mmCIF file of C-alpha atoms in Angstrom:
data_model
loop_
_atom_site.group_PDB
_atom_site.id
_atom_site.type_symbol
_atom_site.label_atom_id
_atom_site.label_comp_id
_atom_site.label_asym_id
_atom_site.label_seq_id
_atom_site.Cartn_x
_atom_site.Cartn_y
_atom_site.Cartn_z
ATOM 1 C CA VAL A 1 1.509 -88.140 -109.420
ATOM 2 C CA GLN A 2 2.418 -84.358 -107.893
ATOM 3 C CA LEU A 3 1.891 -80.178 -108.892
ATOM 4 C CA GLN A 4 4.696 -78.375 -108.657
ATOM 5 C CA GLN A 5 4.735 -75.052 -108.333
ATOM 6 C CA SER A 6 6.602 -72.110 -109.272
ATOM 7 C CA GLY A 7 7.545 -68.616 -106.990
ATOM 8 C CA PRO A 8 8.018 -66.638 -104.096
ATOM 9 C CA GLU A 9 7.254 -63.642 -105.988
ATOM 10 C CA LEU A 10 8.197 -60.298 -105.660
ATOM 11 C CA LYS A 11 5.852 -57.811 -107.297
ATOM 12 C CA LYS A 12 5.640 -54.063 -107.148
ATOM 13 C CA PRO A 13 1.685 -52.830 -107.605
ATOM 14 C CA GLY A 14 1.455 -52.649 -111.538
ATOM 15 C CA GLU A 15 3.411 -55.457 -112.233
ATOM 16 C CA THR A 16 2.341 -58.742 -113.314
ATOM 17 C CA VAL A 17 2.712 -62.095 -112.297
ATOM 18 C CA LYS A 18 2.778 -65.339 -114.401
ATOM 19 C CA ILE A 19 2.486 -68.367 -111.912
ATOM 20 C CA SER A 20 3.179 -71.691 -112.770
ATOM 21 C CA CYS A 21 2.165 -75.621 -112.028
ATOM 22 C CA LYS A 22 4.069 -78.490 -113.962
ATOM 23 C CA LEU A 23 2.288 -82.630 -113.440
ATOM 24 C CA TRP A 24 2.643 -86.137 -113.150
ATOM 25 C CA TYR A 25 -0.541 -87.804 -114.459
ATOM 26 C CA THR A 26 -2.431 -87.514 -118.291
ATOM 27 C CA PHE A 27 -2.278 -84.057 -118.257
ATOM 28 C CA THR A 28 -5.437 -83.424 -120.150
ATOM 29 C CA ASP A 29 -7.578 -85.414 -118.353
ATOM 30 C CA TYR A 30 -8.224 -83.445 -115.532
ATOM 31 C CA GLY A 31 -9.197 -79.814 -115.112
ATOM 32 C CA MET A 32 -6.919 -77.759 -112.958
ATOM 33 C CA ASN A 33 -8.412 -75.746 -109.972
ATOM 34 C CA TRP A 34 -6.901 -72.178 -108.798
ATOM 35 C CA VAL A 35 -6.977 -71.153 -105.181
ATOM 36 C CA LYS A 36 -6.336 -68.196 -103.203
ATOM 37 C CA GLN A 37 -4.809 -68.413 -99.286
ATOM 38 C CA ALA A 38 -4.683 -65.167 -98.085
ATOM 39 C CA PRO A 39 -2.648 -65.143 -94.431
ATOM 40 C CA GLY A 40 -5.229 -64.872 -91.819
ATOM 41 C CA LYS A 41 -8.321 -66.037 -94.339
ATOM 42 C CA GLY A 42 -9.088 -69.367 -95.087
ATOM 43 C CA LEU A 43 -9.085 -70.757 -98.940
ATOM 44 C CA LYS A 44 -11.119 -69.356 -102.118
ATOM 45 C CA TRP A 45 -11.693 -71.312 -105.429
ATOM 46 C CA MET A 46 -10.817 -68.444 -108.160
ATOM 47 C CA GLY A 47 -10.830 -70.857 -110.716
ATOM 48 C CA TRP A 48 -10.620 -73.644 -112.809
ATOM 49 C CA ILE A 49 -8.833 -74.046 -116.580
ATOM 50 C CA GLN A 50 -10.101 -77.340 -118.362
ATOM 51 C CA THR A 51 -7.194 -79.099 -119.873
ATOM 52 C CA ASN A 52 -8.412 -80.739 -123.042
ATOM 53 C CA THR A 53 -10.657 -77.323 -124.739
ATOM 54 C CA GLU A 54 -8.628 -74.693 -123.023
ATOM 55 C CA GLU A 55 -12.495 -73.274 -121.306
ATOM 56 C CA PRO A 56 -11.330 -71.593 -118.135
ATOM 57 C CA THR A 57 -14.020 -71.173 -115.579
ATOM 58 C CA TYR A 58 -13.522 -67.628 -112.816
ATOM 59 C CA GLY A 59 -15.374 -67.162 -109.423
ATOM 60 C CA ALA A 60 -16.762 -64.073 -109.979
ATOM 61 C CA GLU A 61 -14.766 -62.268 -108.072
ATOM 62 C CA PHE A 62 -11.655 -63.102 -110.164
ATOM 63 C CA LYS A 63 -13.004 -61.466 -112.984
ATOM 64 C CA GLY A 64 -10.759 -59.435 -115.228
ATOM 65 C CA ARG A 65 -7.415 -58.620 -113.489
ATOM 66 C CA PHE A 66 -6.854 -62.336 -113.625
ATOM 67 C CA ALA A 67 -6.372 -65.033 -116.259
ATOM 68 C CA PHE A 68 -5.442 -68.447 -116.979
ATOM 69 C CA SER A 69 -2.945 -69.988 -119.381
ATOM 70 C CA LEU A 70 -1.681 -73.566 -119.612
ATOM 71 C CA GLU A 71 0.859 -75.058 -122.150
ATOM 72 C CA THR A 72 -0.518 -78.433 -122.583
ATOM 73 C CA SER A 73 3.094 -79.886 -124.633
ATOM 74 C CA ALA A 74 4.794 -78.889 -121.320
ATOM 75 C CA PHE A 75 2.223 -79.712 -118.804
ATOM 76 C CA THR A 76 2.132 -76.136 -117.125
ATOM 77 C CA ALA A 77 -1.183 -74.199 -116.161
ATOM 78 C CA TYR A 78 -0.427 -71.109 -115.825
ATOM 79 C CA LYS A 79 -1.949 -67.990 -114.109
ATOM 80 C CA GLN A 80 -0.859 -64.464 -114.223
ATOM 81 C CA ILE A 81 -2.514 -61.015 -112.389
ATOM 82 C CA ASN A 82 -1.916 -57.930 -114.343
ATOM 83 C CA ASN A 83 -2.180 -54.634 -111.829
ATOM 84 C CA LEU A 84 -1.050 -56.644 -109.233
ATOM 85 C CA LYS A 85 -2.258 -54.520 -105.999
ATOM 86 C CA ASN A 86 -2.155 -55.159 -102.087
ATOM 87 C CA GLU A 87 -4.778 -57.723 -102.090
ATOM 88 C CA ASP A 88 -2.901 -59.735 -104.064
ATOM 89 C CA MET A 89 -0.114 -61.122 -102.080
ATOM 90 C CA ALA A 90 -1.767 -64.468 -100.544
ATOM 91 C CA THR A 91 -0.403 -68.058 -101.813
ATOM 92 C CA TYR A 92 -1.898 -69.434 -104.796
ATOM 93 C CA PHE A 93 -2.130 -73.153 -105.016
ATOM 94 C CA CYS A 94 -3.400 -75.521 -107.601
ATOM 95 C CA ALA A 95 -5.160 -78.498 -106.806
ATOM 96 C CA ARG A 96 -6.715 -80.800 -109.782
ATOM 97 C CA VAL A 97 -10.067 -81.221 -109.827
ATOM 98 C CA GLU A 98 -11.541 -84.093 -108.963
ATOM 99 C CA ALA A 99 -14.115 -86.002 -106.866
ATOM 100 C CA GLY A 100 -12.378 -83.495 -104.392
ATOM 101 C CA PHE A 101 -9.469 -80.971 -105.357
ATOM 102 C CA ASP A 102 -7.441 -84.296 -105.375
ATOM 103 C CA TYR A 103 -3.876 -83.460 -105.697
ATOM 104 C CA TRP A 104 -2.775 -79.881 -104.273
ATOM 105 C CA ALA A 105 0.734 -78.027 -104.794
ATOM 106 C CA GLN A 106 2.621 -76.769 -101.959
ATOM 107 C CA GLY A 107 1.659 -73.150 -103.040
ATOM 108 C CA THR A 108 3.288 -69.720 -103.920
ATOM 109 C CA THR A 109 3.713 -67.276 -101.769
ATOM 110 C CA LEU A 110 3.531 -63.597 -103.497
ATOM 111 C CA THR A 111 4.379 -60.426 -102.169
ATOM 112 C CA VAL A 112 3.936 -57.114 -103.830
ATOM 113 C CA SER A 113 5.515 -54.259 -101.936
ATOM 114 C CA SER A 114 7.443 -51.366 -104.287
ATOM 115 C CA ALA A 115 9.752 -51.324 -101.266
ATOM 116 C CA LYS A 116 13.949 -51.997 -102.138
ATOM 117 C CA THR A 117 16.081 -54.960 -100.331
ATOM 118 C CA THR A 118 16.915 -53.328 -97.729
ATOM 119 C CA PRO A 119 19.929 -54.479 -94.412
ATOM 120 C CA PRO A 120 18.586 -54.765 -90.979
ATOM 121 C CA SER A 121 19.303 -53.334 -88.199
ATOM 122 C CA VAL A 122 19.783 -55.643 -84.918
ATOM 123 C CA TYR A 123 20.212 -53.904 -81.575
ATOM 124 C CA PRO A 124 20.609 -55.691 -78.263
ATOM 125 C CA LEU A 125 17.957 -55.664 -75.099
ATOM 126 C CA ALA A 126 18.869 -55.948 -71.546
ATOM 127 C CA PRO A 127 17.580 -55.324 -68.250
ATOM 128 C CA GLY A 128 20.701 -53.306 -67.345
ATOM 129 C CA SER A 129 20.674 -52.159 -63.749
ATOM 130 C CA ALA A 130 17.313 -54.141 -63.286
ATOM 131 C CA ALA A 131 18.267 -55.623 -60.746
ATOM 132 C CA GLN A 132 16.805 -59.957 -61.331
ATOM 133 C CA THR A 133 13.952 -60.604 -59.394
ATOM 134 C CA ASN A 134 14.833 -64.712 -60.622
ATOM 135 C CA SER A 135 16.942 -67.715 -61.253
ATOM 136 C CA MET A 136 16.130 -67.179 -64.962
ATOM 137 C CA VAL A 137 16.870 -63.340 -66.413
ATOM 138 C CA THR A 138 16.029 -62.583 -70.028
ATOM 139 C CA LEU A 139 17.617 -61.212 -73.392
ATOM 140 C CA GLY A 140 16.623 -59.910 -76.588
ATOM 141 C CA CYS A 141 17.628 -58.624 -80.207
ATOM 142 C CA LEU A 142 15.857 -56.672 -82.070
ATOM 143 C CA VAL A 143 15.874 -56.778 -86.115
ATOM 144 C CA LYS A 144 13.975 -54.036 -87.380
ATOM 145 C CA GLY A 145 14.090 -52.088 -90.911
ATOM 146 C CA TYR A 146 14.506 -54.828 -93.287
ATOM 147 C CA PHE A 147 13.014 -55.849 -96.306
ATOM 148 C CA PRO A 148 12.629 -59.002 -97.620
ATOM 149 C CA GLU A 149 11.809 -61.890 -95.653
ATOM 150 C CA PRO A 150 13.365 -63.873 -94.143
ATOM 151 C CA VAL A 151 15.867 -63.256 -91.826
ATOM 152 C CA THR A 152 17.605 -66.461 -89.510
ATOM 153 C CA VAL A 153 18.252 -65.623 -86.175
ATOM 154 C CA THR A 154 20.493 -67.796 -83.873
ATOM 155 C CA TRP A 155 22.235 -67.275 -80.613
ATOM 156 C CA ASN A 156 26.020 -68.602 -80.114
ATOM 157 C CA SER A 157 25.824 -69.849 -83.423
ATOM 158 C CA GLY A 158 23.023 -72.645 -82.592
ATOM 159 C CA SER A 159 24.883 -73.243 -78.755
ATOM 160 C CA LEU A 160 21.667 -70.907 -77.378
ATOM 161 C CA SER A 161 19.006 -73.215 -78.817
ATOM 162 C CA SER A 162 16.781 -73.683 -75.687
ATOM 163 C CA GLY A 163 14.875 -70.886 -74.089
ATOM 164 C CA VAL A 164 14.883 -68.974 -77.702
ATOM 165 C CA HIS A 165 12.203 -67.726 -78.784
ATOM 166 C CA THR A 166 11.758 -66.108 -82.313
ATOM 167 C CA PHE A 167 8.742 -63.837 -82.973
ATOM 168 C CA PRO A 168 7.194 -63.616 -86.161
ATOM 169 C CA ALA A 169 7.829 -60.636 -88.635
ATOM 170 C CA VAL A 170 5.560 -57.573 -88.171
ATOM 171 C CA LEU A 171 5.749 -55.589 -91.322
ATOM 172 C CA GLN A 172 5.205 -51.374 -90.298
ATOM 173 C CA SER A 173 6.303 -48.703 -91.972
ATOM 174 C CA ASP A 174 6.615 -50.973 -95.485
ATOM 175 C CA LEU A 175 9.475 -52.556 -93.420
ATOM 176 C CA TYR A 176 9.994 -55.824 -91.187
ATOM 177 C CA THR A 177 10.403 -56.116 -87.879
ATOM 178 C CA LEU A 178 10.962 -59.216 -85.930
ATOM 179 C CA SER A 179 12.354 -60.216 -81.974
ATOM 180 C CA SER A 180 13.893 -63.339 -80.233
ATOM 181 C CA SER A 181 14.393 -63.756 -76.947
ATOM 182 C CA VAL A 182 16.652 -66.430 -74.702
ATOM 183 C CA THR A 183 16.658 -67.212 -71.189
ATOM 184 C CA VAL A 184 19.161 -68.466 -69.298
ATOM 185 C CA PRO A 185 20.229 -69.155 -65.610
ATOM 186 C CA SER A 186 21.605 -65.868 -63.187
ATOM 187 C CA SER A 187 25.056 -66.938 -63.340
ATOM 188 C CA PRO A 188 26.211 -67.090 -66.875
ATOM 189 C CA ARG A 189 24.268 -64.006 -68.178
ATOM 190 C CA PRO A 190 27.221 -61.576 -67.909
ATOM 191 C CA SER A 191 30.484 -63.363 -67.279
ATOM 192 C CA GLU A 192 29.755 -65.887 -70.181
ATOM 193 C CA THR A 193 28.918 -63.638 -73.195
ATOM 194 C CA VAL A 194 25.649 -64.384 -74.802
ATOM 195 C CA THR A 195 25.185 -62.677 -78.588
ATOM 196 C CA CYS A 196 22.815 -62.880 -81.274
ATOM 197 C CA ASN A 197 23.695 -63.737 -84.660
ATOM 198 C CA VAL A 198 21.497 -62.489 -87.397
ATOM 199 C CA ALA A 199 21.509 -62.987 -91.266
ATOM 200 C CA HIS A 200 19.199 -61.246 -93.676
ATOM 201 C CA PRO A 201 20.462 -63.575 -97.269
ATOM 202 C CA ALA A 202 18.993 -61.113 -99.866
ATOM 203 C CA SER A 203 21.169 -58.159 -98.175
ATOM 204 C CA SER A 204 24.731 -60.564 -98.028
ATOM 205 C CA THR A 205 23.836 -58.831 -93.967
ATOM 206 C CA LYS A 206 25.589 -60.762 -91.027
ATOM 207 C CA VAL A 207 25.986 -59.419 -87.830
ATOM 208 C CA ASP A 208 26.898 -60.489 -84.155
ATOM 209 C CA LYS A 209 25.224 -58.131 -81.384
ATOM 210 C CA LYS A 210 26.988 -59.087 -78.391
ATOM 211 C CA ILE A 211 25.062 -58.243 -74.900
ATOM 212 C CA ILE A 212 25.887 -55.824 -72.308
ATOM 213 C CA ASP B 1 -24.053 -68.069 -103.231
ATOM 214 C CA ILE B 2 -23.209 -71.395 -100.432
ATOM 215 C CA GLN B 3 -21.588 -70.548 -97.343
ATOM 216 C CA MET B 4 -19.828 -73.178 -94.933
ATOM 217 C CA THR B 5 -19.237 -72.455 -91.562
ATOM 218 C CA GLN B 6 -17.741 -74.611 -89.145
ATOM 219 C CA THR B 7 -19.034 -73.961 -85.459
ATOM 220 C CA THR B 8 -15.907 -73.459 -83.995
ATOM 221 C CA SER B 9 -12.170 -71.631 -85.109
ATOM 222 C CA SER B 10 -10.556 -73.721 -82.900
ATOM 223 C CA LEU B 11 -10.370 -76.462 -80.843
ATOM 224 C CA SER B 12 -8.501 -78.020 -77.672
ATOM 225 C CA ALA B 13 -8.172 -81.742 -77.431
ATOM 226 C CA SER B 14 -5.259 -84.154 -75.990
ATOM 227 C CA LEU B 15 -3.273 -86.674 -77.672
ATOM 228 C CA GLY B 16 -5.143 -90.340 -77.993
ATOM 229 C CA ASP B 17 -8.161 -88.320 -77.680
ATOM 230 C CA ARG B 18 -11.004 -88.228 -79.707
ATOM 231 C CA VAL B 19 -12.528 -85.268 -81.679
ATOM 232 C CA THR B 20 -15.270 -84.130 -83.907
ATOM 233 C CA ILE B 21 -15.338 -80.870 -86.208
ATOM 234 C CA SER B 22 -18.522 -79.699 -87.388
ATOM 235 C CA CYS B 23 -19.792 -77.653 -90.912
ATOM 236 C CA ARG B 24 -22.977 -76.551 -91.898
ATOM 237 C CA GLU B 25 -23.903 -75.783 -95.173
ATOM 238 C CA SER B 26 -26.260 -72.538 -95.733
ATOM 239 C CA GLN B 27 -28.738 -75.051 -98.186
ATOM 240 C CA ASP B 28 -28.779 -79.014 -99.190
ATOM 241 C CA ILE B 29 -25.598 -79.896 -100.759
ATOM 242 C CA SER B 30 -26.731 -83.646 -101.374
ATOM 243 C CA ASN B 31 -23.414 -85.332 -100.006
ATOM 244 C CA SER B 32 -20.956 -83.311 -101.811
ATOM 245 C CA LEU B 33 -18.477 -82.174 -98.696
ATOM 246 C CA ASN B 34 -15.229 -82.539 -98.865
ATOM 247 C CA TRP B 35 -12.775 -82.218 -95.449
ATOM 248 C CA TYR B 36 -8.985 -81.407 -96.542
ATOM 249 C CA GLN B 37 -5.514 -80.766 -93.979
ATOM 250 C CA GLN B 38 -3.441 -77.826 -93.610
ATOM 251 C CA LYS B 39 -0.582 -78.281 -92.299
ATOM 252 C CA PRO B 40 2.181 -75.482 -90.802
ATOM 253 C CA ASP B 41 3.974 -75.632 -93.614
ATOM 254 C CA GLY B 42 1.221 -74.618 -95.927
ATOM 255 C CA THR B 43 0.886 -78.017 -97.385
ATOM 256 C CA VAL B 44 -2.876 -78.580 -97.727
ATOM 257 C CA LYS B 45 -3.985 -82.362 -98.597
ATOM 258 C CA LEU B 46 -7.798 -84.030 -99.533
ATOM 259 C CA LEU B 47 -9.047 -86.262 -96.220
ATOM 260 C CA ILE B 48 -12.322 -87.517 -97.213
ATOM 261 C CA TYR B 49 -14.724 -86.349 -100.221
ATOM 262 C CA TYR B 50 -18.151 -87.391 -101.277
ATOM 263 C CA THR B 51 -18.946 -86.571 -97.078
ATOM 264 C CA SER B 52 -17.307 -89.989 -96.085
ATOM 265 C CA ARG B 53 -15.293 -91.710 -99.001
ATOM 266 C CA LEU B 54 -11.672 -91.932 -97.491
ATOM 267 C CA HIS B 55 -9.100 -90.913 -99.662
ATOM 268 C CA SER B 56 -6.141 -92.884 -100.781
ATOM 269 C CA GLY B 57 -3.354 -93.026 -97.672
ATOM 270 C CA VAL B 58 -5.720 -91.195 -95.072
ATOM 271 C CA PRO B 59 -5.652 -93.576 -92.278
ATOM 272 C CA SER B 60 -8.792 -95.242 -90.443
ATOM 273 C CA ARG B 61 -8.711 -92.794 -87.915
ATOM 274 C CA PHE B 62 -10.511 -90.092 -90.170
ATOM 275 C CA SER B 63 -14.433 -90.648 -90.688
ATOM 276 C CA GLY B 64 -16.975 -88.192 -92.192
ATOM 277 C CA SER B 65 -20.567 -88.394 -92.122
ATOM 278 C CA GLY B 66 -23.608 -85.713 -92.541
ATOM 279 C CA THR B 67 -26.873 -85.016 -94.927
ATOM 280 C CA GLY B 68 -28.480 -82.062 -95.631
ATOM 281 C CA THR B 69 -26.780 -78.771 -94.603
ATOM 282 C CA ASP B 70 -24.751 -80.272 -91.805
ATOM 283 C CA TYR B 71 -21.618 -83.017 -91.470
ATOM 284 C CA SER B 72 -19.052 -84.026 -89.022
ATOM 285 C CA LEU B 73 -15.189 -85.091 -89.233
ATOM 286 C CA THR B 74 -13.855 -87.619 -86.982
ATOM 287 C CA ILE B 75 -10.770 -88.020 -85.631
ATOM 288 C CA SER B 76 -10.122 -91.476 -83.621
ATOM 289 C CA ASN B 77 -6.884 -91.362 -82.094
ATOM 290 C CA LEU B 78 -5.701 -88.234 -81.401
ATOM 291 C CA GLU B 79 -1.614 -88.634 -82.927
ATOM 292 C CA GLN B 80 1.215 -85.750 -83.094
ATOM 293 C CA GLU B 81 0.550 -85.287 -87.126
ATOM 294 C CA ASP B 82 -3.022 -84.180 -86.452
ATOM 295 C CA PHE B 83 -2.586 -81.404 -85.154
ATOM 296 C CA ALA B 84 -2.874 -78.458 -87.909
ATOM 297 C CA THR B 85 -6.207 -76.867 -89.666
ATOM 298 C CA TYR B 86 -9.146 -78.733 -90.691
ATOM 299 C CA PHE B 87 -11.212 -77.252 -93.713
ATOM 300 C CA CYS B 88 -14.584 -78.239 -95.390
ATOM 301 C CA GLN B 89 -15.613 -77.493 -99.045
ATOM 302 C CA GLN B 90 -18.941 -78.592 -100.984
ATOM 303 C CA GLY B 91 -19.049 -80.003 -104.335
ATOM 304 C CA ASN B 92 -22.309 -78.820 -105.443
ATOM 305 C CA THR B 93 -21.986 -76.058 -107.289
ATOM 306 C CA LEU B 94 -19.608 -73.233 -108.595
ATOM 307 C CA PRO B 95 -18.421 -71.403 -106.513
ATOM 308 C CA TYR B 96 -16.488 -73.755 -104.959
ATOM 309 C CA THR B 97 -16.674 -72.719 -101.450
ATOM 310 C CA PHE B 98 -14.767 -73.879 -97.887
ATOM 311 C CA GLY B 99 -15.287 -73.274 -94.391
ATOM 312 C CA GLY B 100 -13.073 -70.840 -92.169
ATOM 313 C CA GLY B 101 -11.047 -73.744 -90.813
ATOM 314 C CA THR B 102 -11.029 -74.916 -87.703
ATOM 315 C CA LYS B 103 -6.942 -75.327 -85.674
ATOM 316 C CA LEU B 104 -6.478 -78.317 -83.044
ATOM 317 C CA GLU B 105 -3.594 -76.958 -80.444
ATOM 318 C CA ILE B 106 -2.567 -79.464 -77.550
ATOM 319 C CA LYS B 107 -4.297 -79.149 -74.862
ATOM 320 C CA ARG B 108 -2.568 -78.695 -71.254
ATOM 321 C CA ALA B 109 -2.483 -76.810 -68.345
ATOM 322 C CA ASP B 110 -2.304 -73.291 -67.088
ATOM 323 C CA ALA B 111 0.476 -70.960 -67.271
ATOM 324 C CA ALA B 112 0.872 -67.318 -66.178
ATOM 325 C CA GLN B 113 4.030 -65.895 -68.158
ATOM 326 C CA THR B 114 7.357 -64.534 -67.319
ATOM 327 C CA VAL B 115 6.981 -61.118 -68.425
ATOM 328 C CA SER B 116 10.355 -58.591 -69.122
ATOM 329 C CA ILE B 117 10.510 -54.980 -69.917
ATOM 330 C CA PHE B 118 13.500 -53.665 -72.279
ATOM 331 C CA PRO B 119 14.393 -50.029 -72.227
ATOM 332 C CA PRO B 120 15.435 -48.777 -75.562
ATOM 333 C CA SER B 121 19.217 -49.721 -76.484
ATOM 334 C CA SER B 122 21.822 -46.780 -76.734
ATOM 335 C CA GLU B 123 22.769 -47.586 -80.846
ATOM 336 C CA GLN B 124 19.163 -46.662 -81.497
ATOM 337 C CA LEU B 125 18.919 -43.507 -79.450
ATOM 338 C CA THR B 126 21.604 -42.142 -81.286
ATOM 339 C CA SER B 127 19.505 -42.835 -84.556
ATOM 340 C CA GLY B 128 16.382 -41.614 -84.484
ATOM 341 C CA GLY B 129 14.222 -43.384 -82.338
ATOM 342 C CA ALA B 130 13.494 -45.774 -79.254
ATOM 343 C CA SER B 131 11.092 -48.725 -78.923
ATOM 344 C CA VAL B 132 10.621 -50.432 -75.465
ATOM 345 C CA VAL B 133 10.282 -53.555 -75.745
ATOM 346 C CA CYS B 134 8.273 -56.087 -73.796
ATOM 347 C CA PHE B 135 8.485 -59.659 -73.993
ATOM 348 C CA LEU B 136 5.370 -62.203 -72.273
ATOM 349 C CA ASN B 137 6.428 -65.910 -72.611
ATOM 350 C CA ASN B 138 5.430 -69.328 -71.865
ATOM 351 C CA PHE B 139 1.876 -69.268 -71.192
ATOM 352 C CA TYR B 140 -1.287 -70.772 -71.996
ATOM 353 C CA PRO B 141 -3.887 -70.400 -72.721
ATOM 354 C CA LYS B 142 -3.204 -68.358 -75.628
ATOM 355 C CA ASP B 143 -5.500 -65.222 -74.887
ATOM 356 C CA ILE B 144 -3.528 -62.633 -73.236
ATOM 357 C CA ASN B 145 -3.965 -58.638 -74.342
ATOM 358 C CA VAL B 146 -1.814 -55.706 -73.401
ATOM 359 C CA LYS B 147 -2.640 -52.326 -72.961
ATOM 360 C CA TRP B 148 0.669 -49.167 -73.070
ATOM 361 C CA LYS B 149 -0.415 -47.200 -70.222
ATOM 362 C CA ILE B 150 2.895 -44.719 -69.458
ATOM 363 C CA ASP B 151 1.064 -42.505 -67.164
ATOM 364 C CA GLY B 152 -2.244 -41.933 -68.554
ATOM 365 C CA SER B 153 -1.230 -42.197 -72.074
ATOM 366 C CA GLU B 154 -2.663 -45.679 -74.029
ATOM 367 C CA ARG B 155 0.141 -46.062 -76.794
ATOM 368 C CA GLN B 156 -1.929 -48.523 -78.950
ATOM 369 C CA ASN B 157 -1.371 -46.297 -82.237
ATOM 370 C CA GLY B 158 1.898 -47.698 -82.953
ATOM 371 C CA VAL B 159 2.380 -51.280 -81.224
ATOM 372 C CA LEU B 160 2.873 -54.173 -82.988
ATOM 373 C CA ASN B 161 2.477 -57.327 -80.232
ATOM 374 C CA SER B 162 3.592 -60.472 -82.227
ATOM 375 C CA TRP B 163 2.620 -64.441 -81.489
ATOM 376 C CA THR B 164 4.241 -67.503 -81.193
ATOM 377 C CA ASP B 165 2.688 -70.765 -81.882
ATOM 378 C CA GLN B 166 2.394 -72.981 -79.340
ATOM 379 C CA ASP B 167 6.072 -74.084 -78.546
ATOM 380 C CA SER B 168 6.750 -77.967 -79.816
ATOM 381 C CA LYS B 169 8.671 -78.975 -76.592
ATOM 382 C CA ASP B 170 6.273 -77.600 -73.913
ATOM 383 C CA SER B 171 2.884 -76.133 -75.505
ATOM 384 C CA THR B 172 3.004 -72.229 -74.996
ATOM 385 C CA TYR B 173 3.080 -69.478 -76.917
ATOM 386 C CA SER B 174 4.901 -66.178 -76.266
ATOM 387 C CA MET B 175 4.136 -62.800 -77.276
ATOM 388 C CA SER B 176 6.183 -59.521 -78.137
ATOM 389 C CA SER B 177 5.148 -56.380 -77.742
ATOM 390 C CA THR B 178 6.899 -53.695 -79.435
ATOM 391 C CA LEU B 179 6.207 -49.431 -79.100
ATOM 392 C CA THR B 180 8.911 -48.124 -80.584
ATOM 393 C CA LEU B 181 8.622 -44.358 -81.000
ATOM 394 C CA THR B 182 10.994 -41.341 -81.378
ATOM 395 C CA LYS B 183 13.797 -40.041 -79.190
ATOM 396 C CA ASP B 184 12.243 -36.581 -79.031
ATOM 397 C CA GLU B 185 8.672 -38.255 -77.745
ATOM 398 C CA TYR B 186 10.287 -40.216 -75.592
ATOM 399 C CA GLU B 187 12.442 -38.072 -74.241
ATOM 400 C CA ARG B 188 10.016 -35.872 -72.688
ATOM 401 C CA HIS B 189 7.896 -38.889 -71.384
ATOM 402 C CA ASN B 190 10.198 -40.524 -69.044
ATOM 403 C CA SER B 191 7.613 -42.826 -67.418
ATOM 404 C CA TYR B 192 6.888 -46.404 -69.528
ATOM 405 C CA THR B 193 4.488 -48.986 -68.125
ATOM 406 C CA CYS B 194 3.783 -52.441 -69.741
ATOM 407 C CA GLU B 195 0.056 -54.018 -68.730
ATOM 408 C CA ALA B 196 -0.620 -57.702 -69.485
ATOM 409 C CA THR B 197 -4.261 -59.595 -68.616
ATOM 410 C CA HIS B 198 -4.205 -63.300 -68.952
ATOM 411 C CA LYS B 199 -6.539 -66.094 -67.069
ATOM 412 C CA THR B 200 -4.093 -66.981 -64.332
ATOM 413 C CA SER B 201 -4.572 -63.772 -62.695
ATOM 414 C CA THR B 202 -7.314 -60.804 -62.344
ATOM 415 C CA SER B 203 -4.745 -58.400 -61.173
ATOM 416 C CA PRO B 204 -3.624 -57.177 -64.585
ATOM 417 C CA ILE B 205 0.232 -58.368 -64.335
ATOM 418 C CA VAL B 206 2.247 -55.184 -64.877
ATOM 419 C CA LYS B 207 6.119 -54.367 -66.046
ATOM 420 C CA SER B 208 7.963 -51.214 -65.910
ATOM 421 C CA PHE B 209 11.286 -49.239 -65.594
ATOM 422 C CA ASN B 210 11.303 -45.288 -65.180
ATOM 423 C CA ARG B 211 13.615 -43.620 -67.063
#
């Protein structure tokens, strides 16, 4: 028993998306739920779709642009959204309706942007002449100006695995920005060489940035 | 409508511990109250339905109880998987409604951070703009806040703070705070300040370089 969602999806405002959810038990016996979870938000019931009669029911804020398809013979319940707006990016889950939301899916994360696949700018960050007032020393790599997600950021191809902190991407200027820091002892900082490797799948961009 | 309110959005306990999460509804929901679990990778899972029925696959460490408008989920032998976010929902009427959730983060000692200021990279400079980066790492509890006071200027406008999650290994957080602007607007101020308010002190920790 399990529900498998589709996505992730990149959409520009205006297009429409059709998200799927397929299953493993007697499909038509149980209806289907759709839930919209927005980022720093909780879960909200968008609505149902009755599997046998094809009669859907909508939460009142999800009337109009949202519609419920379903293709019995294959065992997929759809959910398309027309006139995609900013408001719409979030993970969407499907859980069958029972004595509670029985089985859920993995969710499908929809992003709406009208921004193009952009490569990143890795700039290295360093103390410079700042006298290290500690036995630890810290470095960073700034990944700004990219789209979409995500970028994988390592230090020395993984060899520097501890001391590292890679911060969550911030959407500013309609493109992303993240940063990472490594913290190494006062001695292997400059003599040894510390470098950060960024790679952006979308744009086949991978670059190494050595530090001061 | 019918709202579900969870007393506290966040909660901090230790392993082996025992904790109780509340959820009160806006009006008598008979006993149509279910509990679910969301884990950091987004997956959700039914835990208890109809107030107190343990779902197939859920350990006996979970328990529910309640009536009328108040219910409680009690987790008794706190384990490492149980540090996720929990939700309540009513099955009494459409629209189905859930509560804001409540997240379990592991409790621990206090730790002020290790603060570091990084002056804008040359390669960037020689392009168009200049981002100042302030890293504040490995501190507890999560609450800290910062103002960019560049000698009588608070650049709250055009700042990007960013939060990490309770580091697996040592259970703290870390925050980046980037102050990105233009070569022009940087090349006239030459005096950038990074202020940081955290429990451990009353003295607002400030870090800088001035050129």
